[PDB]
Design a protein around this ligand. Structure first.
Ligand SMILES: OC[C@H]1O[C@@H](O[C@@H]2[C@@H](O)[C@H](O)O[C@H](CO)[C@H]2O)[C@H](O)[C@@H](O)[C@@H]1O
Ligand SMILES: OC[C@H]1O[C@@H](O[C@@H]2[C@@H](O)[C@H](O)O[C@H](CO)[C@H]2O)[C@H](O)[C@@H](O)[C@@H]1O
Length: 752
């Protein structure tokens, strides 16, 4: 009932859960499994994809509302409803007492794509998928309608079995261009679309509420404008149905460049149809478009969506280019702190304990210990650092074993492989990590942090035959490569939307969502560190690709650093939860003002420096939070605000820290006013004093190795490298600076 993996194991039978005498129904219901029923055809076998923009198609009989931008769509017994949020559908609402804001559209229907033979389909199943498109199959015996659609596709491709095409409207549309087999039309409220059938198959019902075509293939396009030249361009690719779509990437270690090429492969539905499509690019893509793709832009082809303006680009492929900025295992010892005061805070942290038994609360605790251990090493407190790492080893050697001393499955503190979906689940579970396959990057990222800190000091422990095998299993669950026997590809990540999606099932009418983008960035950071420590180049590079891409989406959709995406009337300077179809300044729990910003900053670690790349943003966001609070009396998590403020004004951060850090004493789970429960006084004091000495993050300098950071204080650069190798290295920076680094050390600020 368990599979050995090095010294560890995972359960292959669902354990008899030890509830610990807790009767709370919510807690008990968490210790379960994801849904038994998966709505997929027999063409889709093996580990099932989860955490996707389209997931509600797999989980609900039909689907919930989905956002294949620029459209929204939903499957129903009667067919596929299609919608586009026009400006008149978009609203920005504020609930002052709740402190929440919501940017959202409507769940309406512009028309329904129907099958002539039935309006009572039995179910809609996933019939195929690739990196960002899905093929949904509405089924009723011989009657079938296969719908191919995707984020960044202004087409919906429709294939019929045993019937023909129907477009049904509640109010008769305006057919403003009638080319026989191709029509340009607008809804009563002036939304512009087109429909395409093979030559000779002419549309009927023009002027009525129901447009019909005898063809067994049609495509729908959202048109950017009521424009016959655009209609003519959409005709060129309307018969090229996307079958394959891959996002292939490379990391150039010398330059830091992460290059991603998005390539489709299509199947021709008429003779001579080109192999290509029209893509709709999101801001995080087109702002980084490779020179070589520029000639494919369709300049005036714009769509407004929740994430700003999408633009059209034609052809088989396009490429984006991003810059990986490095990460560190920890800030080094470069601050002007009182070392005895910091040593005292390190000892104070021995009082801390996890505030729950589930993967998330245990995760926060081990992240806390892993953050303290290098600081203890720096202060010369090696015995204390060893105590922290020993505690990490004790916790991980427990959780990474599924059996007890007698060889029976444990009832808690273990991992289990759900074969139905194909996912590793940890018990105790929380935040629907097991029942909805939620948040695996957020939770398991902390387990990887703990393992990476152990590996930094003890390479033996981290070997695959020891505890490394189980760590690499957890990593595969949340970010597997292609053709993994146990897990779907890159579970958490949507390579086209550019971000992770936290909900395994996506059964919301706003599509999927992600709240803590920083806990996603923390997961990617820790995989980079773990992979560097254990000599796994392929895994490291995949995590670099994720870190760097996710960063591009965070800066657009969570922060809107360019002040182009959020509506002018939206008050806050952050979106807390991004959805497929809407944006909230709100949290998944009842919180105050600080938390609706800081949930996208925490935890602070050696990969957090991406938060400081846009100093005008950091100032604008801080000042807005300060305005709303009305002072620097933060309602909760004060230390996170001080650490954030230190990115641009460490003098201010320092004065706030000095005034309040010692307000309360040792760890108290009931009181997060000053110190957030995943944080410590030691971490806070070490971070702010390091920033005070280093100055600003400098993202204009790259290096030819991946574990580094560059800071700039009034034109004076500080270069930091950590070397995980047994051998000395030389690191070349993009500004001409060159340094040597000894084995298993920082170049500067090793401490002692
Ligand atoms: O959707 C991902 C997020 O899910 C959150 O839990 C949700 C519950 O709070 C709510 O009552 O029910 C929905 C399902 O309808 C749950 O998804 C977690 O708390 C978040 O951590 C998670 O990212
Ligand atoms: O401060 C006590 C409150 O903490 C909340 O936990 C938050 C998580 O839900 C969220 O996923 O992460 C943040 C940051 O780690 C946590 O503070 C509980 O949900 C509340 O019920 C609790 O009162």
């Amino acid at each position: 009932h368990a599979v050995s993996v090095g010294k560890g194991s995972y359960a292959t039978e669902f354990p008899e859960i030890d509830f610990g005498g807790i009767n709370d129904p919510g807690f008990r219901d968490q210790q379960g499994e994801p849904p038994a029923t998966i709505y997929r055809s027999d063409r889709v076998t093996g580990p099932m994809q989860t955490n996707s923009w389209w997931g509600s198609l797999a989980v609900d009989r039909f689907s919930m509302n989905q956002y294949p931008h620029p459209f929204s769509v939903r499957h129903r017994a009667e067919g596929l409803h299609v919608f586009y949020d026009a400006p008149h559908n978009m609203v920005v609402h504020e609930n002052r007492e709740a402190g929440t804001w919501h940017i959202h559209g409507a769940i309406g229907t512009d028309f329904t794509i129907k099958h002539s033979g039935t309006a009572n389909f039995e179910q809609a199943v996933v019939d195929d998928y690739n990196d960002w498109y899905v093929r949904g199959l509405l089924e009723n015996g011989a009657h079938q309608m296969a719908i191919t659609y995707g984020v960044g596709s202004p087409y919906i491709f429709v294939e019929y079995e045993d019937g023909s095409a129907v477009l049904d409207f509640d109010i008769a549309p305006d057919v403003w261009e009638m080319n026989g087999h191709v029509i340009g039309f607008s809804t009563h409220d002036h939304k512009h679309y087109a429909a395409f059938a093979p030559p000779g198959q002419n549309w009927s019902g023009i002027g009525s509420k129901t447009l019909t075509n005898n063809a067994d293939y049609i495509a729908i396009a959202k048109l950017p404008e009521k424009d016959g030249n655009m209609l003519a361009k959409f005709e060129q690719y309307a018969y090229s149905v996307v079958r394959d779509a891959v996002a292939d990437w490379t990391y150039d270690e010398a330059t830091g460049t992460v290059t991603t090429t998005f390539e489709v492969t299509t199947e021709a539905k008429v003779q001579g149809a080109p192999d290509g499509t029209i893509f709709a690019l999101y801001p995080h893509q087109y702002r980084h478009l490779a020179s070589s793709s520029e000639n494919q832009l369709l300049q005036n082809y714009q769509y407004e969506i929740i994430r700003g303006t999408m633009i059209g680009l034609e052809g088989k492929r396009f490429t984006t280019e991003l810059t990986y900025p490095g990460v560190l295992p920890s800030l080094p010892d470069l601050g002007d702190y009182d070392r005895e005061r910091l040593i005292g805070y390190l000892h104070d942290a021995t009082s801390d304990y996890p505030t729950g038994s589930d993967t998330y609360e245990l995760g926060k605790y081990i992240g806390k210990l892993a953050t303290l251990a290098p600081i203890a090493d720096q202060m010369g407190e090696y015995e204390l650092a060893e105590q922290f790492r020993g505690e990490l080893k004790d916790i991980l050697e427990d959780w990474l074993q599924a059996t007890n001393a007698s060889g029976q499955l444990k009832g808690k503190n273990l991992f289990y492989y759900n074969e139905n979906w194909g996912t590793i689940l940890g018990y105790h579970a929380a935040h629907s990590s097991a029942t909805r396959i939620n948040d695996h990057h957020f939770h398991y990222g902390y387990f990887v942090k703990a393992a990476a800190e152990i590996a930094r000091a003890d390479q033996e422990w981290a070997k695959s035959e020891n505890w490394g095998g189980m760590i690499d299993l957890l990593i595969r669950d949340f970010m597997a490569d292609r053709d993994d026997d146990l897990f779907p590809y890159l579970r958490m990540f949507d390579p086209y939307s550019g971000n992770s999606w936290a909900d395994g099932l996506a059964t919301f009418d706003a599509g999927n969502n992600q709240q803590s983008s920083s806990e996603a960035m923390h997961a990617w950071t820790n995989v980079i560190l773990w992979a560097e420590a254990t000599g796994n180049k392929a895994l490291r590079d995949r995590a670099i690709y994720l870190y760097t891409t996710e960063m591009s989406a965070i800066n657009e959709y969570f922060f809107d650093v360019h002040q182009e995406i959020f509506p002018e009337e939206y008050g806050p300077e952050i979106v807390t939860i991004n959805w497929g179809g809407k944006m909230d300044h709100a949290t998944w729990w009842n919180s105050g003002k600080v938390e609706k910003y800081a949930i996208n900053w925490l935890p602070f670690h050696g990969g957090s420096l991406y938060l400081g790349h846009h100093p005008d943003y950091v100032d604008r966001a801080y000042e807005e939070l300060r305005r709303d609070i009305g002072s620097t009396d933060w309602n909760l998590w004060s230390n996170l605000v001080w650490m954030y403020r230190a990115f641009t004004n460490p003098d201010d951060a320092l004065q706030q820290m000095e005034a309040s850090i010692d307000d309360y004493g040792l760890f108290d789970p009931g009181n997060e006013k000053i110190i957030e429960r995943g944080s410590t006084k030691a971490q806070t004091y070490h971070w702010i004093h390091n920033l005070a000495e280093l100055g600003r993050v400098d993202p204009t300098v790259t290096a030819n190795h991946p574990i580094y950071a560059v800071f700039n204080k009034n034109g004076n650069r500080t270069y930091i490298v950590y070397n995980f190798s047994d051998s000395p290295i030389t690191v070349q920076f993009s500004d001409g600076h060159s340094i040597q680094v000894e084995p298993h050390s920082f170049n500067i600020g090793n401490g002692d």
